[model samples]
Target: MNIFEMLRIDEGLRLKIYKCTEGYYTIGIGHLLTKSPSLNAAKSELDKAIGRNTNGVITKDEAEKLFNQDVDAAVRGILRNAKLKPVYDSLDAVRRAALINMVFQMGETGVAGFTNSLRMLQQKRWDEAAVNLAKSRWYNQTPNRAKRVITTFRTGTWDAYKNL
Candidate 1:
């Protein structure tokens, strides 16, 4: 299974704006509109996508486009982390996808905070890595999604793809 497929499942597709768990205004597959440095810039993109300024709706094509950009940014951020570079390179595709998903939910900084977990992953100690991941507040905040992500890290399987 590909990373995009896994992310699409995790993020889900939404055409309208809604508040994410952190209460930030989000739209179109977890795109954080409120977090954009310029709300006007983001709103303009939204306006163009839906051809209107009132309803906060987006097209599927536009949402997919934003999703791709977000994923690219997340991947680039992960690779740029000095400490994470080797750990990330040591992972296989599926495990790398798991890391990308984590980066998507939290920023690269958030994932970098998991020093022990990164070490465990680098050592190929899947159990330890999963345990370390599960001990976080992130796991508690989104148990089901975290469960799937942790399971992927532990088993290096595409069960998430299967479920989708």
Candidate 2:
């Protein structure tokens, strides 16, 4: 809803990429396409996905627009998760937002990929969930961030949980 959030793109980086990780070719805060793959490949993908820009780069402005559009769908993704939905109504805004943040980072399927962690979240079993998140490759790939989320789960404070 605010500009800061819009500045970058996310895809549930708190979780790991088991199936469809950030292609990096994708746009947003973590727009990796420009960084990871061949510019031509990124350009080709973006042509079909975002627009007809042959340029490999998508300005922050355009990335913001693209991500905002994704935000709505991302929220739905978190809501639609079979594990997350069951306990959604019980959480306060802060708690609910934690999940939403993940969805924004990874989208629905990515969020769902953390089956055990999310299931633990559904039961309000923070400790187990945190541990699961910490042990996964996601934790190894981004250690500080994983810790931050674990702390958030442990204390229920915003803190550095989001890692961004």
Candidate 3:
């Protein structure tokens, strides 16, 4: 199943995911671009936000605490703006979610700053995108986080998230 399918969110879940991801953008964990909630809460909130019961659970209040309205606006902006559709369309759902997650954390402008990577994705150059993704300034700032996102883009698998 795709990441979205795996999460099984309806509109409510989308809102929650938006909230949770937005939280990551704002109150990032330590120096990381996002914060990690308790594993169970994270999973549950993700599941509920996606409209499914997951291996874990999360609270809306906690999500709100971490992510405020500004973050929500950013995420909503990405969803409303169709600019990334080409890249999104080219990827598998898992990779797409990873990208969306990245965008949610980094903001569209932040992700778009990797011009070469965006170009590579636009041209369906997966390997180049992977390489560019690794070399990005954002990646340079957060090596482990970049590695995780790159792994998802390259392999289309959702593994454990660490360091945040």
Candidate 4:
């Protein structure tokens, strides 16, 4: 499946505002309202997409739009990260999807904090990269999802999603 499909399953769709596990005001496929670059802009977009003021609600189609935009943002963040650029370039789409998934959940800065893991990724040390990722709060807080992504990185395949 494509990255968007994978993320849609992982993040899930929500038409109304809901508090995420980390307690942020989120909506429409993990879009964090508090962290939005332009709250007014986002509100306007949602309103337009819904044909009226959303009042913290949107359609599945609108949510899909937001999801695509958020994925674009995550990809841009990864590309802009100096440490990740070359590593990103060297990886296949499967591994790239795993990294983008990480960035989507944790933000570029959070992923950047995994210095050793990133180094292992860059060197193609798949097991070492997985080991380093397992040592993080990301893994602790979201073990299932993190394990899936880590397995994707380690195997460079979509095998992680096979059973689940």
Candidate 5:
């Protein structure tokens, strides 16, 4: 059976916000629940993963909250799955968060290949490591990311790349 059978709007895709049969203001397979942030956080993640932003959507605060959740999960993975909790915690606040962001974007395995980069971080070779990072494939992918990442890695402050 197709997905609609499980969660279908018999009325179909109306672009406008409408009342659910239960009198909830909902849209897109109930993507934005009126009373269920905990419930639909997963659904919202699904919508994000699949690029399904139909009808209306979650709020900015909701999206940012989800982003924080994502960052936390990534940090947790580095802490648990990668067995790097000690290393992660050893860094000051800023570098720690930067590593979490990198792990979030690249996965522990993805950043794992950054052997030299990680080593530089481990040794507190901030400048050399920033240079290596600036010269890295990661930098080639997006040059200005270094401004925030490198600065934070050096000074231990939050990166402003997200305009936050």
Candidate 6:
């Protein structure tokens, strides 16, 4: 099964993604409870929450706190409009998943902030994309975490992060 299917995360992760993307903290949610320096950190937090909440039920207060009305609407809109086939068609599962997680942690605008990285990805310039990913405000902001994702994207191999 694909990771999405395995996790059953269409909605839950989307909400977590919204929280990360919108850049706000809400109480009683694992993602917001942890202080993440980067998208990878956010993902790890979400993973732990998912592990703990096997039923996928998140509280309303947690939702309201994490996502303001506009952001919540936007996230719902994105999810509603999302076409799984095209996303699956355009990139490998790993890349696609990474992109979704990126978009979630960084809003569409924030992800679009990676102008050069997007260009490189569009051109299928994996090496350049990886480099561009590292050369961002996000990277500059969180040096170690940025390095981990960039390495994963470039090398196409999962290395357990040691010494960020």
Ranking by lDDT: 1, 4, 2, 5, 3, 6
Please state the error at residue 121 of candidate 4 in Å. 0.7
Local distance difference test, candidate 5: 0.56
- Model 6: per-residue Cα lDDT over 51-150, one tens digit each: 5541334555545444443244334433553332233246665565455545544555666556667666656688988877876777787565566557
TM-score of 1: 0.88
Candidate 6: C-alpha lDDT: 0.50
Candidates' RMSD to native: 3.0, 5.8, 10.2, 3.2, 13.9, 10.3
Model 6: residues >4 Å from true position, as ranges?
1-89, 160-164
TM-score for all models, in order of appearance: 0.88, 0.69, 0.54, 0.88, 0.58, 0.49
lDDT of 5 by residue, 56-143 (tens): 4445444445444555677678878554565676687667767765675456887767778677888888888888877776677645
Tell me the tens digit of each residue's lDDT in model 4 across 6-89. Answer: 887788888887667877667888887764455565666557655688877778888887788899999999899997777788
List of clashing residue pairs for candidate 5: none
lDDT, each prediction: 0.85, 0.58, 0.53, 0.84, 0.56, 0.50
Q: Mark the 10 consecutive residues where model 3 has the least summed lDDT.
A: 25-34
Residue 118 miss distance in model 4 (angstroms): 0.5
Ranking by TM-score: 4, 1, 2, 5, 3, 6
Total residue pair clashes for candidate 4: 0
Candidate 1 ranges beyond 4 A from true positions: 35-55
Lowest summed lDDT window (length 10), candidate 2? 9-18
